[PDB]
Amino acid sequence: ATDGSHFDFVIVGGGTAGNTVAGRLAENPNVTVLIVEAGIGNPEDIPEITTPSSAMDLRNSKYDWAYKTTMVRRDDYERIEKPNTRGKTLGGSSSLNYFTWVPGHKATFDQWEEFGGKEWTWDPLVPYLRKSATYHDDPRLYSPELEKIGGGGPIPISHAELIDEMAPFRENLTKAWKSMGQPLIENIYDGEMDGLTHCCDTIYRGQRSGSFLFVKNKPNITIVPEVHSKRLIINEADRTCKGVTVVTAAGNELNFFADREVILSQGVFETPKLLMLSGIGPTRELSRHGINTIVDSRHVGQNLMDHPGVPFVLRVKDGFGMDDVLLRHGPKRDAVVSAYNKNRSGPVGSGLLELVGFPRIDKYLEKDAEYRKAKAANGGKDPFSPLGQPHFELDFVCMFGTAFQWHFPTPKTGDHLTVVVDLVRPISDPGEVTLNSADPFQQPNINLNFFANDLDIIAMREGIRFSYDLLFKGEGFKDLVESEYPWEMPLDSDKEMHRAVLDRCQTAFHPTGTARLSKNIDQGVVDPKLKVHGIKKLRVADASVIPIIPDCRIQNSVYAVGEKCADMIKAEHKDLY
Amino acid sequence: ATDGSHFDFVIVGGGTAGNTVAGRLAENPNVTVLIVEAGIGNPEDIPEITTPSSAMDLRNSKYDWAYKTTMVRRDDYERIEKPNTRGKTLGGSSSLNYFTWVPGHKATFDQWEEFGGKEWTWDPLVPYLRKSATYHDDPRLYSPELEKIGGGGPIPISHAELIDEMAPFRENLTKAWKSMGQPLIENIYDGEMDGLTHCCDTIYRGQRSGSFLFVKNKPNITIVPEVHSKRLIINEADRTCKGVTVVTAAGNELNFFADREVILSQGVFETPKLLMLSGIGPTRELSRHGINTIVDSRHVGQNLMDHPGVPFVLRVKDGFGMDDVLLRHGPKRDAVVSAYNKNRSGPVGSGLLELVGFPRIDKYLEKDAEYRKAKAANGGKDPFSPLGQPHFELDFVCMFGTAFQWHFPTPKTGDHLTVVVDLVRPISDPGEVTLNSADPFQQPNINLNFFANDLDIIAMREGIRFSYDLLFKGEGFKDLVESEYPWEMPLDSDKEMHRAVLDRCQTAFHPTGTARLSKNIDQGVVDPKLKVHGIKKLRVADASVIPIIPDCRIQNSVYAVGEKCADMIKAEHKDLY
Ligand SMILES: Cc1cc2nc3c(=O)[nH]c(=O)nc-3n(C[C@H](O)[C@H](O)[C@H](O)COP(=O)(O)OP(=O)(O)OC[C@H]3O[C@@H](n4cnc5c(N)ncnc54)[C@H](O)[C@@H]3O)c2cc1C=O
Ligand SMILES: Cc1cc2nc3c(=O)[nH]c(=O)nc-3n(C[C@H](O)[C@H](O)[C@H](O)COP(=O)(O)OP(=O)(O)OC[C@H]3O[C@@H](n4cnc5c(N)ncnc54)[C@H](O)[C@@H]3O)c2cc1C=O
């Protein structure tokens, strides 16, 4: 693209919501759309991106921002980690994520009303939760009712394409789950999600479905990859966003201008950073780094909320995990790799997560004197999920997963199960994203503030206990477990579990909130139309907009945000739509 | 003590060097000495303090500052830890340390000349390295020449009082060491230290020898424990230190004044902090926290240097470690505990470290292409120890040691060996101590900057390899090893070892340098008489003074610093001494 070029719409950050907004705005072939993006422009050409079983290997790769971030910062404990993985590539984090497609609980989205008014509640959002996807059920295994989860969008989704060898595993896990007295559930798309379900995925015919699928073969979209944002171009007199400044690989600064609107989609971490570098954020924090304040927006970078996860690995009987096929070199791996290469069939095309659980654990919580007291102190309402929401998402990954074992080596032998214990309704206060300096090439500082509240530790402990009961005592599955890796979970000691949770937890990869939808600038950074409070012609569409984190893996809500954003922009520009 | 009281000398921080200086100045019964100290005043009354086998249990106890500190801060990796243990109690860190008494290499102390001139070199310092100690050899096991290591001081020291059951262990380790072609050595007190030695300790008749032994039964010493320093009292016009302000348990601020001199002994972390709070430090760093600059002293808090350590545990054959006697509850433990209680005999009185190795590893280093290139680039001189110094201190702790395994649980069964691989001559740049704020009750911020230079990683890797060779291949000992805890050291992969070293390393507990001796304020913070550049009547005596870290565990050099400081103060006040 030529320096100083004008486009109707500029999307800053070709990520998950970014491409969604861009592709929708481009549906009028006459509307000019520019996308600027730090990463490569041709993800579909990269096997590790398109191949679902390679996902975890994308951590630390060239497609990963690989941020340092503080996971917990309590007086008794603090840990900082790297990499806190985020996608750096067209498609953003939808190009390196773990595929699960799940919206969340109706009661939770209904509470968005406090921030976004009625249009940001469950029912009105349902269509936006479905618009991006085209649902498939080729093997005809699931209720035809479930076809309503795809509205016709360019992101192919399907229930996991089941691995044949894992059928015995699925059957035992199912038996175990029911033996605990917990429900099976298939429809988790209408606001209810209690039980063990067969998850859907952004995978189809063993290929990844990334947001880059929104923006190809559209000649009205100009895609400029490999450029790093320096600053939003803001006219102070007009209080207007004019466009964006970027730096090329050769180190040249380029300005691009939007004739209608700029949409900021740089994700939960970089969106608030670029706002601040552009003069929009907490005034004391700007001054501290030599940045003028154009709009004193206190909430920018604040309210960072994520799900803490404590994963744990069990060694399981031979043939009940995929380690020997996918993880280790050999003829077995060679075979499935050769099949995948010829027609994309086989387990190489698998995302390795097929059964997912959304339980409550009231009866475990009730056994803890402290939880009992906190609940009473809250007038008898459950602190975590007072509206019937799950307490956990339990992901049963059917092999050792490096992405969920940041400090333990990969075992050399044996098949494994990796259970991701994801606290989906935490009550710890949010963390924050702050500036390290005014340098656009430095990562912002990131504190997730996991487990600031002790109750969260107690719940996480109890969700590990629930998972252990299920797997060590559950019908069928109890016979599959061989050992705990890399040592025993100290479930016998509240004291030890306290240390175990803090020291072993990680991000579940769902950060949100840093430029949240709101009714005014004293509550959040963007209004219900996702316009930046205080600025004209500037909107944010990405996970930073999310005012209350969904009860599950969040990519579905992020696409929803992009779909709604595009709709709201179209409604505004009558002459174009 | 009464508010506003005057004393000839005020020691701020009743720690290792602190008490040394105080006790020596008090040798003229007419000189009044005050000691202020944050911790308790009666350590000799605390079993866990006086009992050498309890040392490791003092981590996280009430006697531990338990600082958060950043261990490594590289672009590819960063870890922050808690607790970074320091003594909070009369005697300071000499009240919770692991006893080893070893001075270091002559060539290294000779290089102090660049900072302190001739009087801070090996020969002149020898007497100061010996003054604090009274050497014992009751069982008459060692050369009578070695009695020269005790000059008659109030700190009883002895070669480790050997545990009988560990004799077979010592004998096998010795055989293994010699089988590798490395020397045995007993005299490591005259500047030479190449080999495996029987270490001496600040233990005698199974009681800890702490610096509090310097300051009891001296009625001219006023001891005020349980008070937290707020600030040094500095007269700007006179450029003079007048005394110190402290806060009591009840929250009252008290001023105490020195008629001759104030000696700051708050240790490597708190000494630079209090200087800064008092207006002495880097001016930009003071202003940033609202503190006036009285003296722009750039080096304050800078030059923090410590030894990185990568410990590792081996499970060893039954009866070749002390786990079953000291670590686990039972009749065995009951028996030795009952003996200790009646007459202080038995392994309960042991510091658990009896053999210590000081090897070079030139031939391991030479195998690494990068080391070879770096050495050539340094004109053919070894980067680490170009003057013949050791590369490592290898501590062979004869049981599982929690103090050296910060992220692994304590094994439930088996006897263990804990090998502390201490890189004693690192070449990474120093870290820093900075202010978090002007609040005297907040810990300063601490970055140790371990492994900033890749060569250090290569050496640490190779010192682990040397240790593994010794123990897995060495004569006698090879037959004792049962397994690696908690998994295998990835010695087969330079790549994995790189991650292993960074992720498993810790402080070896020897921080230094943050107010270093120097010839002028452009080089350091105190002059050769340990006077603070720019200020009269103010000296620093503690580990922050140390300009080049010794080649080993450092408590001996710290007492040396205190002994010299006291001598230099006495020489100045003729009318009193
Ligand atoms: C491991 C991983 C695994 C998970 N797994 C599951 C999953 O299983 N399913 C689930 O639903 N969610 C999961 N998630 C969340 C899910 O993947 C969602 O994608 C996120 O929750 C929300 O997607 P945004 O639209 O809010 O943010 P985005 O980062 O996508 O797009 C931002 C774009 O901007 C560019 N960009 C940024 N800065 C600059 C700059 N300075 N100059 C120029 N360009 C810049 C940057 O390169 C990128 O292209 C997962 C995420 C991670 C990993 O991040
Ligand atoms: C685990 C541990 C184990 C090791 N093991 C071996 C060992 O085996 N042998 C060895 O030679 N060295 C080892 N070392 C180092 C060795 O122990 C040495 O002691 C150190 O290397 C050097 O000793 P300072 O004189 O330089 O510093 P100090 O902290 O002693 O005294 C400071 C005093 O000031 C007080 N004080 C501080 N702040 C305030 C305040 N605000 N307001 C009021 N008071 C305040 C504070 O409470 C304390 O009393 C080891 C240390 C640690 C642990 O710290």
Automatic annotation (TrEMBL), chains A, B:
Entry's Gene Ontology molecular function annotations: flavin adenine dinucleotide binding; oxidoreductase activity, acting on CH-OH group of donors
Keywords: FAD, Flavoprotein, Nucleotide-binding
Keyword Flavoprotein annotated: yes
Positions contributing to FAD binding: T16, A17, E37, W65, S93, N97, Y98, T100, S229, E270, A543, Q555
Matching PROSITE patterns: GMC_OXRED_1
Pfam families: GMC_oxred_C, GMC_oxred_N
Native source organism of the sequence: Aspergillus oryzae (strain ATCC 42149 / RIB 40) (Yellow koji mold)
Residue span, Glucose-methanol-choline oxidoreductase N-terminal domain: 87-110
Listed name of the protein: DNA, SC012
Keyword field contains Flavoprotein: yes
